[PDB]
Symmetry: none
């Protein structure tokens, strides 16, 4: 059976020193967690789990669990992983790289530095979180009240506004963009409202 998104673990003791450069060659975009060394282990006596890396590997096309497993073996050594699980929520796995996800936070796992995350081949978690249809409607309606409230005259004035106070309403630039897309028509109405409204004084 086939899918695009996988994760597996890389073990420092059975991967070459140029491993980080070697994953880069696969051409596939990857995100690699900070070195997960301080994982509380549930074996008796021993303090932390063997030291490991978590990798978020997104294939170009829909491929199988094993096509990856052997693509990585023949690239880092037959002994580097064995356990390739298929990833169901890319956003969630990316947050898991730092134990900062919903699953991991409720399991109180040892939170890592998101700055240690390594992005091979231009991973940007941003290109993997599109939004629920309802969400789109919800945000759009916020964009409305926003253009209303501050009498934003045009999509530049809107962007400038989001640039600053963005987070407060939970918009970014690249987000408004995905929100207003297709509703453009409706936008020109708002922006004319605002224009001819500010022309009143």
């Amino acid at each position: 059976e086939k899918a695009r998104y996988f994760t597996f673990l890389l073990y420092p003791e059975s991967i070459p020193s140029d491993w980080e450069l070697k994953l880069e060659t696969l051409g596939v975009p990857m995100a690699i967690s900070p070195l997960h060394d301080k994982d509380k282990s549930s074996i008796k006596g021993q303090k932390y789990k063997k030291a490991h890396y978590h990798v978020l590997y997104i294939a170009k096309n829909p491929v199988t669990a094993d096509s990856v497993r052997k693509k990585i073996k023949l690239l880092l050594g037959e002994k580097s992983l064995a356990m390739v699980q298929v990833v169901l929520n890319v956003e969630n796995m990316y947050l898991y790289l730092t134990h900062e996800s919903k699953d991991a936070i409720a399991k109180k796992k040892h939170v890592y530095d998101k700055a240690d995350i390594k992005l091979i081949n231009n991973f940007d978690i941003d290109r993997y979180v599109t939004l629920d249809v309802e969400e789109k409607t919800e945000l759009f309606n916020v964009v409305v009240s926003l253009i209303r409230a501050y009498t934003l005259q045009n999509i530049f004035d809107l962007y400038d506004f989001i640039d600053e106070n963005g987070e407060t309403y939970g918009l970014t630039i690249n987000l408004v963009n995905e929100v207003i897309a297709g509703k453009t028509g409706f936008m020109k109405l708002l922006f004319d409202g605002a224009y001819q409204r500010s022309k009143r004084g």
Copy 2:
């Protein structure tokens, strides 16, 4: 064949203890019924139906019955459901979670606590009460006579109007927005009518 809204049953004896956290990961918003243990069963002798949970699972994009069924198997165990039905009225299935829907009320099913409902990933039933198609047409036609009558010159003057006298015609802001969406073209005609009418 494909759709966005589904329901299926989760059985407590064949789902992990962290099942509730696990469904959270799917990223998909779900609403999960209170534990349906007191369902009158129609098998002879036995009192209540095997104890189960009802799930209302709304996919991000139009997907198939089976893409769900296996997404959940590989997430909870091959044995947790087998029966994924496609939901036709999201509001009604949400009311069915507590046996508080029209179907269930007339079947006299054992009413549950709506407080036991579990919302995974920010389900809000409020945002799937989209309008009957007719309603949209009806309301638009009101928005028309409204822009006509008060010579509202542009969507701001329209909003400002709704802000006040909204309820009287049964509009809110967020409601106009859902009404006029798509008919935007038609709007600019109304708002030019109005503009050039007041210029007279």
Copy 3:
């Protein structure tokens, strides 16, 4: 056998004084004719939420107004035609010369709008649009307001209402802006 649209008759002498408020409760949208005394009875246009039977209605109304208020529930085939029949203003009734009533006495329970029941053939849409054209051409109507104002008056003559233009021009909006610019820049010539 099942259907959504029915009509029956209500008799004033065997229905309670709060009958009009009681029908409201059924939750079903209804249109009730003006008092049909100069044919004493009422005609009711009752459209069920879901496909239900002749008798599920007959008894829902008996247990709501008294066992003696109707007995005769017919199933309606053309909702628009039965709505016109409430005022004897339909094709059937007009040729039978029946006593025309005031459409202002029609009573709409639970937000009946006969409009939400008259959609139109696709050809019809094209046909009417083409009328709307010749209409904007002929009287050099400069914009949808001048169009509406026009329909408001002489509407019936071409068979338009406001709410009908709306359903006609919908989608063809593009095409409209061309007509309305024509008209505009045409009148700017004088």
Copy 4:
């Protein structure tokens, strides 16, 4: 959307013709087919089933699905390709009864190529005479129409949808004439 069925005069009321009118659906009814019954061309408002019609007519007076509306309209008079080669008894097209404003013409939709062909004519026409907007175009068609094979109601069906494209032509023409 499109059906036909047969109405038998001995098992339909005397006001049958007025009763079909009420259904609100446009129908074309053949001349009385006695020299082979009535043939009915019934076009539903929306896509409906064989049986929703059969019972709608039963509960109204006491059904094959049509594939080519124009061909079934010609069959009402035995004047179609199928019937002419079967030498069937040709009837008077004047006995055809149009309920609720049937116009077989509203099913003379264009070959798709035709639409493209005509549009391209509408182009060269707006170019050549520098027609500035759809009124100037129409006025033009009104007179010289036949010469290019246009009517008003035909441009209308042609330009429909390509309206965008039109605004480009009409702005060309406008800013072209603004030149002197």
Copy 5:
């Protein structure tokens, strides 16, 4: 087995003098090559109304020009390529260095128009569009009239006609108004 497009050869010594008028009667649109003497024969591009067989053609022509006029009816796979072959101006014939003929000697029976037979690929549309772009950019063409005028003249050089631009820009109209506003406000500078 059946197909719409065929070609065959007509020999002047075993076809009547009114042959050209006789093919006209078949009702089928044909294109006939210039007299191929310097390869004496004619090449015919015969497109049937409906999907018919190799032999229904071979005998329709025998019973129309004489049992001795052809025997060899091949089925045409690329109509455009066979029409180019009529003048030895096709990809096959040009690389075989065959004696190029005058395209003005081509005879079109019953309103053949090779045009109604060359539709184009989705990629082609994109390609052309991108040419129309650089064209509107380069010469600062301000609106679809100034574009047409341009194509009218220098059209063939970029491989456009009027009717072709029309099929190219169709649908992408939005995108057009942007080009034509660019051009307009560019020239206003």
Copy 6:
């Protein structure tokens, strides 16, 4: 059932000598692999698979498996193929011509010379490198920040900008064109923003 992209095999012993010129006539763009003679064969004893060619044949319009099979039979002989498969990933099948694809590389198949690939009728594997859909959204969002940052006023000022600094953001002209297509609506908003923003001095 119908599709645009196919592949089949051509056998040198049952195809004419002018086969390469004959495929040219079909008018359809094809890519033909290097002569696949050194294919390890899984029949016992025998070393290489019968000698064959792989053809990547992209129809003008959506056509059926069999409309191709017979178009090729009546063009090369009834005995040249029998097996026409429908191609799912055009870029992947073009890489398979040389055994240089993901499938073939992991199966260790005998890599061929990409220089022996024959392109009939102007195949360019490139004019089917249409943008991953995500790519389109990513690029558009760049084009946005571009029009914002430099206050580009209209699609000519945009193009002029791409002409120069294009590579830096990974745009060409013909690429913007395939990016903005369809989002034209949204463009006009950006371009008005920019216009009325620069009108502010």
